Every structure is written in C-alpha cells, then in structure tokens.
Amino acid sequence: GEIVISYYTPANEAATFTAVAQRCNAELGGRFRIEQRSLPREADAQRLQLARRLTGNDRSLDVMALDVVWTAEFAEAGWALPLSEDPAGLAEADATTNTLPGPLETAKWNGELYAAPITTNTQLLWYRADLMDEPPATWDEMLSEAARLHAQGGPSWIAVQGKQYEGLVVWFNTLLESAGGQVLSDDGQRVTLTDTPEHRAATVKALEIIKAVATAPGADPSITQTDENTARLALEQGRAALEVNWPYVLPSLLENAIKGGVGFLPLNENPALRGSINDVGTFAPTDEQFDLALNASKEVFGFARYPGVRPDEPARVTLGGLNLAVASTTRHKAEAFEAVRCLRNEENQRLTSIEGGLPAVRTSLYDDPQFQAKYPQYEIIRDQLINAAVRPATPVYQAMSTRMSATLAPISQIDPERTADELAEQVQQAIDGKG
Ligand SMILES: OC[C@H]1O[C@H](O[C@H]2O[C@H](CO)[C@@H](O)[C@H](O)[C@H]2O)[C@H](O)[C@@H](O)[C@@H]1O
C-alpha cells in the first residue's frame, strides 16, 4: 500500500479540507494519499495538540495547518521545516507565486518561509438588515444601535469573542491597531502598549470599547464565555442583531436556514432549494439556488466593514488564517511538500472559500467573476486586507497571548487605565522570557 500523508486542520473546517484532500488524492494518481485529521476548535488547543505530537516525536505527523501566529515558535523549535528543505525545490516558489503578500509575511521567520499560506481571514460586521436601516460604522454606533434595540425588546446582544482565549486577544489587537497602537515594536523587542502618549491612548480606547460592550444595557449575559461559535449562534438564534466574525458565517447562515435552524429566514420552506444540501450535509447548491438563497437572506442579513473606533477612520482588522507547514517528524518530506502544493492549488482554493467560507490566498481569485459571484465577501475582504492589522510575530507568542487574555478577562472587570499598565507589564514579562 501507498504512503499516507496526515493533514491536521481544525475540526471547524474538517468537512472542507476532507473534500480538498479527496480532490488531491484523485489528482495524485495513486502515488500517495492524503488523510485529513481534526484538531480542536479553538486556537490555543489546536497548538497544544500539535505540540504534543511534535514533542512526542509522532513519526506519522506530516502536514499541519498552523494559525498565523505560531510561525516564529514552530520555526525556532525545529517543528516546522523551512520550505527550502523541499527535496524537489518547489515549495518556496509555490508559496510565493499568486499568494497574497500579507498572509505570506505571517508564514515567515527571520526572512525565510516555514509554511505556505492556504487561507487568510479578516472579520466582518454581520447585522440584521431587517431591524436597522444602515449598519453601524463605529463601535460607538454599535453601542447606540444595540441600545435602541434593547429599548424595543429586540435582539440587543452584540456577538463578540470575549472569553479568555486567542479570540479576545484578536479583538483587542484590532481595536488597538484601529486606534493607532501596536503591542510590540516592529522588531519584536520592546512593548509599545504604553511607551508614548499616543500608544497609551490607543490601548485605553481599545479597553474602553471592550468594557463598554461587556457592560452595555442589552449585553449578552454570558459574554465572558463567548467565541466564534457563540457569536455565530447568537445571530442565527435571534439574540443578536450585530455580530463581528469571520467570513464563514455567511455559508453557515444560508446552510442552517435551509435546514430550518434560522427562525427569521425559513429557507427550508422554499421548494426551489430542495437538494441544495448535498449527500454529506454540506451546502453546495446550483448557481441558481445559491443566488436565490443569498438574495432571500438580503431581506434579513447583511455584511459590512468591521466598525472603526472613530469616525472616518477605517478599522485595521487583525489577520487570521492557516499556513501549511511540513512537520519535522515526517518520514516522507518529498510527498509532504507535494501535498502542501496540491492542497492549496487554485481550484482547491475556489472550493475552500465557496464551500468552506474561508478566504483564499490565491490573489487571482479576487478578480475572478465566478469567484466574486459565489464568494460575495471577497470585496470587503480585499478592502480590509489593504490596511490589515497583524498580531506580532514572536517565538514567545503563545506565552504572551495567554498572559494577555488572562489580563483582559473577565472583560466585565477591565479598567482601561489600570488594565493598560497591567497588560504592558505582562507582555514585558513574556518577551523577557519569564514564560
Ligand atoms: O474561519 C473561522 C476560524 O475561526 C478561528 O480562527 C480564527 O480565529 C482565531 C482566534 O479565535 C485566530 O487566531 C485565527 O487566526 C483565525 O483564523 C478557528 O480557530 C478556525 O479553525 C476557523 O477557521
């Protein structure tokens, strides 16, 4: 029997990347096979399980989909092989061509590639288009619109990622960079949360926003335990009319509405969409069915730019995504690197975004009319990539992030001025190596 290349991804996209792997297996003509294996649903726990396999020298571990913040650590640990170790010498060129350069930077350490981007990510504003006329453009307007809805007994929750984990650090980073701040200096060696008056003011403003959302009159009473999934559910279940979340929320809403899970969008009652869910449960409609389902959603659901912190200042939205790394444990370097190239080829990218919701990194797709029609999020994604925020690249990232979320949470108890100083001190201890 053939070589088996393991391909670890978060369970959130197991269905999509199982499909991509199966396409690759057919394209590979039997020379080897790729098998998808699922990691946990939240970032911190995805890393822990990879770290366990790597530290335990799991020789069956071949390809791993890393979050865009683990590159420096995995490179320095020897866990992610440099692309230059590809026996075929093709990995570096494949990663570099027709690949968005912002995402590509997240796969680098010390000027060298240790992974090939496969998906990027940038959060959008999602809103109930039937309950307001235009969406909020700033966090002040988010709070005012939520208060209006709360006064009328409407869905008053703002759906955010507020629990003690990476998603809270992402929220903070976006608000911070949108206000003109940054966590670390460009070289990663100094803390810049409070080192100048303008940097301090950006940190305080970001903390003011998180605190205000957490203490808002109609706020989610479980906001201190919220993540991507609770935010998606809060809007689908009619408890929130305002949500910030990644682009996968659109196909999720259409799919669950067709299945009968969205009260205010009973697409299950529409006979023309029978069969839009395929044999394994994935929303995969005809072109006509997609248009009809998307158009119906527009009555009650829209997306817009992530809200900024001040008027006429577009948000700087934190980049997310996945970069494919070959694990140093692999017994089959040549096939692992070849698997990476197949998994991220242009037609697999097309499917990854249209079916999975995850933004492609292949630059060409954002100009492709067929892609634009079936992945309507593309234009706001592109707009937000032009001024994206990026979490710092540092080999102490996980340690720094754990301290930050432990300082930010519970978000109900943030004090903007004092938490700003505690955050700066906790980050300093992280880059100092205290751990
Ligand atoms: O597409 C949704 C993804 O949500 C998570 O990943 C995003 O959010 C993380 C923080 O919670 C970021 O660190 C990451 O960069 C983002 O891509 C989830 O972990 C992914 O599995 C989902 O695809």
Numbering used by the authors: 14 to 448
From the paper:
The Mycobacterium tuberculosis (Mtb) LpqY-SugABC ATP-binding cassette transporter is a recycling system that imports trehalose released during remodeling of the Mtb cell-envelope. Recent studies in mutant strains of Mtb have demonstrated that the LpqY-SugABC (Rv1235-Rv1238) ATP-binding cassette (ABC) transporter recognizes trehalose and enables the recovery and recycling of this liberated cell wall disaccharide that would otherwise be lost. The optimal conditions for the production of Mtb LpqY and mycobacterial LpqY homologs were explored extensively in Escherichia coli. This yielded LpqY from Mycobacterium thermoresistible (Mtr), which has high sequence identity (72%) to Mtb LpqY at the amino acid level. The overall architecture of Mtr LpqY is typical of substrate-binding domains of ABC transporters, consisting of two globular α/β domains joined by a hinge region, which in this instance is formed from three flexible loops.
To determine the molecular and structural basis of trehalose recognition, we solved the crystal structure of Mtr LpqY with the trehalose substrate present. The Mtr LpqY-trehalose complex crystallized in space group P412121, and the structure was determined by exploiting the anomalous signal from iodide-soaked crystals. The model containing bound iodine ions was then used as a search model to solve the structure of a native, higher-resolution, data set by molecular replacement, and the final Mtr LpqY-trehalose complex structure was refined at a resolution of 1.7 Å to an Rwork of 16.9% and Rfree of 19.4%. Two Mtr LpqY protein molecules are present within the asymmetric unit. The Mtr LpqY-trehalose complex adopts a closed conformation, which is further stabilized through a central arginine residue within the hinge region (Arg404, loop 3) that forms interdomain hydrogen bonds with the carbonyl oxygen of Leu332 located on loop 2 and the carboxylate of Glu179 from domain 2 as well as being directly involved with substrate binding. The trehalose molecule was clearly defined in the electron density and resides within the acidic binding cleft formed between domains I and II and interacts with residues from both domains. In the Mtr LpqY structure, both of the glucose rings adopt a classical 4C1 chair conformation with almost equivalent dihedral angles across the glycosidic bonds (φH: 63.2°, ψH 65.4°), thus having rotational symmetry about the central glycosidic oxygen atom, mimicking the conformation of anhydrous trehalose crystallized in the absence of protein.
